[PDB]
Amino acid sequence: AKGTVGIAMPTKSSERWVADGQNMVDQFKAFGYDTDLQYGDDVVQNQVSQIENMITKGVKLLVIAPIDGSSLTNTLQHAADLKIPVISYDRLIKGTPNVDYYATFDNTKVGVLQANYIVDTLGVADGKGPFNLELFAGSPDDNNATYFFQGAMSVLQPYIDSGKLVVKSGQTTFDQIATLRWDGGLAQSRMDNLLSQAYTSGRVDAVLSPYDGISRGVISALKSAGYGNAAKPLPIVTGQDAELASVKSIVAGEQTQTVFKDTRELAKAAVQEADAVLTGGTPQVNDTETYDNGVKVVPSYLLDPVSVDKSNYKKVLIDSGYYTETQVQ
């Protein structure tokens, strides 16, 4: 009787969104809501058409993780004129007043964690160095990308300024380092060029990777450039999402770090607060200042990310029930 909630996820090609979606379906059912769960396959127009259809089919509320944060303005005016509230999921929808609430992880903190891992492992706080560092950011049309990047830079800045970390390629700006569609292939190709053109001599010691798919593409390029043997070890490579292939890589001593974001917790939060919206309640917010979407600062609820390496992967990922033992093998 409570109706159907539309859930518009960006793609299945990054595995977290499959879990975000399924966990929301199950939690919405627990609250008495049907769902229409759709994946855009990273085609902006597929996601737009999916949302348009949800609106015409009379969903009660939309939960949307945008592919392109600025692509939904006309569509969401249609939602607003049908009185369908909008929850922005994980990534912030920009450029429109028609976003009611934003549920995500603390994206600045994700970046801080990634950068801390590099700094702590290299020992630059003790004066060790210098070390060569290269940088990657996420997709320019994902508002989260600048947060991960600026969060990391808050930690890396003093060491880049002092010369203890050196970006040998000179590629330091968000625009230079952003990776379209978070794509591992494009990341690999960029890393290829950094290694062949900027590292004609010497080696890279750390790579700030903001996402596991990028991490694995970077690692492939490094391997093709002769890293990953005893004579020339892989650099430190960070990550995000604890994708299965990256957990396996971490256990193998290849990728060094990732960041765990428990999709069960974000799904639970989005459903709880969707239900609060639909029943005239007060949605839980813990941040009202950060997430300016270009039109307004969207009331937000930020969950906690957790840094993972080989020393704590079992505790964080297996003992928590997120993965089974054989899932990450």
Ligand X SMILES: OC[C@H]1O[C@@H](O)[C@H](O)[C@@H](O)[C@H]1O
Choice from 14, 47, 257, 293 touching ligand X (CB under 6 A):
14
What is the rounded distance in angstroms from the CA atom of residue 313 to the CA atom of residue 29?
Answer: 31
164 touches ligand X by CB under 6 A:
no
Which residues are within 8 A (CB) of 156 and not within 5 positions of it... i.e. 6 or more apart? Answer: 115, 118, 119, 133, 165, 208
Cβ(182)–Cβ(156) below 8 Å: no
Residue 141 in marked binding region: no
CB of 303 to ligand X, least distance (A): 11
Residue 149 burial (CB < 10 Å; 0-12/13-18/19+)?
buried
Tell me the DSSP string of 226-247: T-SBTTBPPPEE--SS--HHHH
211 touches ligand X by CB under 6 A:
yes
What is the rounded distance in angstroms from the CA atom of residue 89 to the CA atom of residue 302?
Answer: 11
Residue 81 in marked binding region: no
What is the rounded distance in angstroms from the CA atom of residue 147 to the CA atom of residue 109?
Answer: 8
94 touches ligand X by CB under 6 A:
no
CB of 231 to ligand X, least distance (A): 33
216 touches ligand X by CB under 6 A:
no
User: Which lies closer to ligand X via its Cβ, residue 59 or residue 67?
Assistant: 67
CA-wise closest residue to 306 among 254, 240, 256: 240
209 touches ligand X by CB under 6 A:
no
Residue 142 in marked binding region: yes
CB of 258 to ligand X, least distance (A): 10
CA angle in degrees (0–180, nearest 5) for 326-318-18: 75
Choice from 42, 100, 106, 142 touching ligand X (CB under 6 A):
142
| Proportion of the chain in helix, strand, coil states, percent, rounded to 5 | 45, 15, 40
Choice from 24, 85, 91, 136 touching ligand X (CB under 6 A):
91
CB of 268 to ligand X, least distance (A): 17
Stretch that binds ligand X, among 76-84, 138-146, 150-158, 245-253 (CB under 6 A): 138-146
Count interface residues toward ligand X (CB under 6 A).
12
75 touches ligand X by CB under 6 A:
no
> Quick one: tokens of 44?
């902006």
Residue 203 in marked binding region: no
Binding string, 218-237, against ligand X, x = CB under 6 A? --------------------
Stretch that binds ligand X, among 42-50, 71-79, 136-144, 229-237 (CB under 6 A): 136-144
Residue 220 burial (CB < 10 Å; 0-12/13-18/19+)?
middle
301 touches ligand X by CB under 6 A:
no
Residue 38 parent element (H or E): strand 34-39
User: Which lies closer to ligand X via its Cβ, residue 33 or residue 147?
Assistant: 147
Residue 310 in marked binding region: no
DSSP state of 183: -
CB of 137 to ligand X, least distance (A): 11
Q: Which amino acid is at 50?
A: Q
Binding residues: 16, 90-91, 142, 144, 241, 261
Residues of this chain that interact with ligand X (CB under 6 A) are 14, 16, 90-91, 138, 142, 144, 182, 211, 240-241, 261
